[PDB]
Amino acid sequence: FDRTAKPVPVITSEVTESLEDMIRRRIQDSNFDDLQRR
Amino acid sequence: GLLVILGTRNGELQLFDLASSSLLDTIEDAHDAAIWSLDLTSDGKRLVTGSADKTVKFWDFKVLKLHHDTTLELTDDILCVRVSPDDRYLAISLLDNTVKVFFLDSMKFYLSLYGHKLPVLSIDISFDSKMIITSSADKNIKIWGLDFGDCHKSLFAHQDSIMNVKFLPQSHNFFSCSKDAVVKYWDGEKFECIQKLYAHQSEVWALAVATDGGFVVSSSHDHSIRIWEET
Amino acid sequence: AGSQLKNLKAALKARGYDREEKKKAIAEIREEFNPFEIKAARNKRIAVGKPGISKQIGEEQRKRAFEARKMMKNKRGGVIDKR
Amino acid sequence: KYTTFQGSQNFRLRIVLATLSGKPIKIEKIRSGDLNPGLKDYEVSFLRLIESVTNGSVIEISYTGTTVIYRPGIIVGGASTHICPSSKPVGYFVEPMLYLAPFSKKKFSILFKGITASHNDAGIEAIKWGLMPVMEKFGVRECALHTLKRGSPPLGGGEVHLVVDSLIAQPITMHEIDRPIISSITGVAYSTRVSPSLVNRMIDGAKKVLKNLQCEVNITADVWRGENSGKSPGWGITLVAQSKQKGWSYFAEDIGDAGSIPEELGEKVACQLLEEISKSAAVGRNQLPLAIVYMVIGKEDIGRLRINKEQIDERFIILLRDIKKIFNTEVFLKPVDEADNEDMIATIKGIGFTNTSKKI
Amino acid sequence: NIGKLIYMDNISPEECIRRWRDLEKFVPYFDTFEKLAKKWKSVDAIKERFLTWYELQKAKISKQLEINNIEY
RNA sequence: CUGGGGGGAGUAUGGUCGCAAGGCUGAAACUUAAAGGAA
């Protein structure tokens, strides 16, 4: 049968590891999307 | 035992012993320029002398005198020689940032190991004749696999200059003494530093390992000679 | 009490050209200072589960089951290994 | 019911020709008088590759492993992957797929994963530059062996994407009643996980042997850097001689191992190539099997191909005996009518083959 | 002679080659490298090997048919 | 010192042929020197 929407993603150790090394790349290159004070 | 070969700064080689007096014989004009490194074969009857006249030479022992028979002239000032501990390879370190591994039985030019980026000091061949070390003034020693000439590690030691590097007798562990008053004990499998020995005060010019058992002596610029044993 | 950041800087000053000591120390502080991949209950008289690891093995199991069924789906032969 | 063969010789050719002909075979006594008797793992994984490629074919290995029953089925192809064992490289499994490759429902897009080269097997450059042009002029037009990464032995770790995408009906009838004039001689010297000077040493050795013939020598050079290099050090050299007016080619390859001089290997492969040119006439000694297989599964006409005296051997005539054992056809060796050499012209009347799997 | 030897299938293939004068191994049999070196030090042995539409289709098929007859 | 496609101004492009991105260099088979760059 066909199904309407994709289910909510299960958060496993692989996706936490991928997300953490994304954060590590951004945080060692200081690629921060902060607000800048006018 | 009881017999010493030696080469000097100028074009001279010399032979001494233990029971009798100094000179068995000297060979004036053993080389045109500064000799830099010699090595016996494991049976001892045939030795190799590489010198800064851009030549290496081979010598045999005729009966207790030296027989020059062949000479390989290179394009560049050879400054280290070594043979394998099973008469198999002749690895020679040139001033042109490289080493060359030859076959002793053919002068075959097996390999050229390259990429050290300064002139390159002491070599060592392992007991299985599979793994070589390569020290230089680039403050790092390189481990090479001799079957295909492929590098394994390029580990950065020794912040001045590694003067000498020597294996243990039966293992793939090795020692390297350097120009910044430190000897260092490594393994050839995990490539850790096993120990960081800190007894000298100045430039450690040489070290020598026992043939069996494995206690190592190191001798330096502060006129000191010191022994290192097991615990 | 004291911050996880303060305890993390203290753990780095605690642990401090060897490599495997750094591999061991980094893996130790990662699996120590990651508390959201364990689950802890409260003892009424404590790490009681490993949610992300259990999830990834439970979904890799059915992933290889699904690929095996997709490989089986329109086959008609098969080797008969009687060895 | 079953055509019976004995012994584990020509095993891939027997299973391949049984798949082409659609005839149930038995292969009996697979090394039965031996210490570890039976089928080996690389030929068992070749059977698994046959089950991947076809559909509805039942293979039935015995208890002892020394006899196999192949009742073939429809070649369907599809996209697949094959994790072949360390006992044989990817060439051992992509060589017998080049016969079954243009005769399936869906086009062959397989990627093999394992060791790339071996001393006693086909390489990537061997398969490509030698064995693809003979198919390219036997009728297929879109065939490609891609290397995504390559792995020298013993650890390997190299993947090879075989893609054929011309699904022909039957191969055309060959007519090569000439010896093709060699226009150029090219090659490829490859090395993985070693220094880039070994490739130039191999090239210089091969070309210093080749320098006295008055043709043009060109050897391309590839070192493999990065993850594309695989898990082991290795290096090798493959030369081809190229007839450009028709497209024919004659190849020779080898690989070096622990203790091998690259100038030695280059001059060895160069002299082995020149001997293949000597003992060759319009095919190679290794391009000859699938050449006469495509001639025997062509149309129901006469196709003739020139061969020389030295290409006849026990391998060639055991090939011919297996061909006649499966689908009952003979080759007719008529000699040429000029006598400065000994060349036969093998005429084969092809069986009435079509591929009946491709949907119309 | 050679075709009768090939398809006379009660004699071994090496016996066919012997009285005229294995495929898992892909690359063919070569000599020793030393014999091949002394054989191919010379080069001159192989220096001479070195150096309307409807009616068109009908002509191709009649060419194949006359090839069929003159080789039958 | 004879040879000629078809207007002007533009727009789009899942077609074909090209040219072009990455990402500190040295530096890869080596997590490797000096020096340089950047901030």
CATH number at residue D207: 3.30.360.20
Closest CA to D13 of D327, D354, D313: D327
Query: Which segments within chain A are labelled E, that is strand?
Result: none
| Whether residue D304 sits in one domain with residue D171 | yes
Shared domain check, D187 and D171 = no
Provide the angle, in degrees to the nearest 10, between the axes of the packed helices D288-296 and D11-21: 20
Q: Does residue D106 sit within a domain?
A: yes
Which residue has the closest alpha carbon to F33 C1'? B138
Instruction: Report how far apart, in Å, the C-alpha atoms of B126 and of each of B103, B169, D13, D240 are.
Output: 16, 8, 47, 40
d(CA D175, CA D295) in angstroms, rounded, equals: 10
Measuring from the CA of residue B148 to each C1', which nucleotide is nearest?
A: F29
* The token pair that represents B112 in the structure block: 């050229």
D219: in domain: yes
Residue D160 sits in the same domain as residue D12: yes
Q: Are strands D302-308 and D175-176 parallel, antiparallel or unpaired?
A: parallel
Q: What is the DSSP pairing of strand D58-61 with strand B111-114?
A: unpaired
Q: Side chain identity at D98, as an amino acid letter?
A: L
Residues D34, D129, single domain; the answer is yes
Q: How far are the Cα atoms of D100, D144, D180, D281 from residue D138, in angstroms, in the given order?
A: 14, 15, 16, 17
Sorted by sequence, the CB contacts under 8 Å of residue B200 that are 6+ apart come out as B181, B182, B183, B218, B220, B222, B224, B226
d(CA D334, CA E65): 19
Structural domain of D82: 1-177+275-355
What is the identity of the amino acid at C22? K
Q: What angle do CA D180, D181, D182 make, to 5 degrees?
A: 110
Closest CA to D84 of D112, D108, D53, D111: D112
Q: Are residues D4 and D98 in the same domain?
A: yes
Strands (DSSP E) along B18-115, which ranges? 25-28, 35-40, 46-51, 55-62, 65-73, 78-83, 89-94, 98-103, 111-114
Report the alpha-carbon distance of residue D93 to residue D43 in Å, rounded.
Answer: 9
Look at residue D91 and tell me if it is in a domain: yes
**In this structure, how many other beta carbons lie within 10 angstroms of the beta carbon of residue C52?**
20
Same-domain pairing of D342 and D314 = yes
For strand F, give the nucleotides within 7 A of a protein CB. Answer: 26-34
Residue D112 lies in a domain: yes
Residue D61 sits in the same domain as residue D133? yes
Chain D residues touching B147 at Cβ < 8 A: 233, 258-259
Q: Is D309 a domain residue?
A: yes
Across the interface, whether the CB atoms of D95 and E39 are under 8 A apart is answered no
Q: Do chain E and chain A touch with ≥3 beta carbon pairs under 8 Å?
A: no
Same domain, D202 and D292: no
Residue D1 within a domain: yes
Cβ of B154 less than 7 A from strand F: yes
D244 with D265, same domain: the answer is: yes
Closest residue to F32 (CA, C1′):
B154
Q: State both tokens at D38.
A: 């039976």
Residue of B nearest to D193 (CA): B150
CB contact under 8 A, A12 and C37: no
Rounded to 10 deg, the angle between the D197-210 and D262-278 helix axes is: 40
- Is D360 among the domain residues? no
Beta bridge partners of B99: B93, B113
Last residue of a domain, one of D250, D274, D298: D274
Q: Which of D215, D246, D274 is the last residue of a domain?
A: D274
How many domains does chain D fold into? 2
- D128, D129, D130, D133: CA torsion to nearest 10: 90
Chain C residues in contact with A11 by the CB 8 A cut-off are 52, 55
SS (H, E, C) D81-101: EECCCCCCCCHHHHCCHHHHC
**CB within 8 Å: B114 and D233:** no
Whether residues D4 and D126 share a domain: the answer is yes
User: Can you give the CATH number for the domain in which D351 is found?
Assistant: 3.65.10.20
Instruction: Please identify, among D274, D301, D317, the residue that sits at the C-terminal boundary of a domain.
Output: D274
* D187 and D162 housed in the same domain: no
Helix axes A13-28, C51-72, angle to 10 degrees: 120
The crossing angle, in degrees rounded to 10, of helices D41-53 and D11-21 is 20
Cα dihedral D100/D102/D104/D110 (nearest 10): 70
| Resolution of the experimental structure, in angstroms | 4.6
Do D34 and D164 share a domain, yes or no? yes
For residue D11, being part of any structural domain is answered with yes
* Alpha-carbon span D179 to D305, nearest angstrom: 10
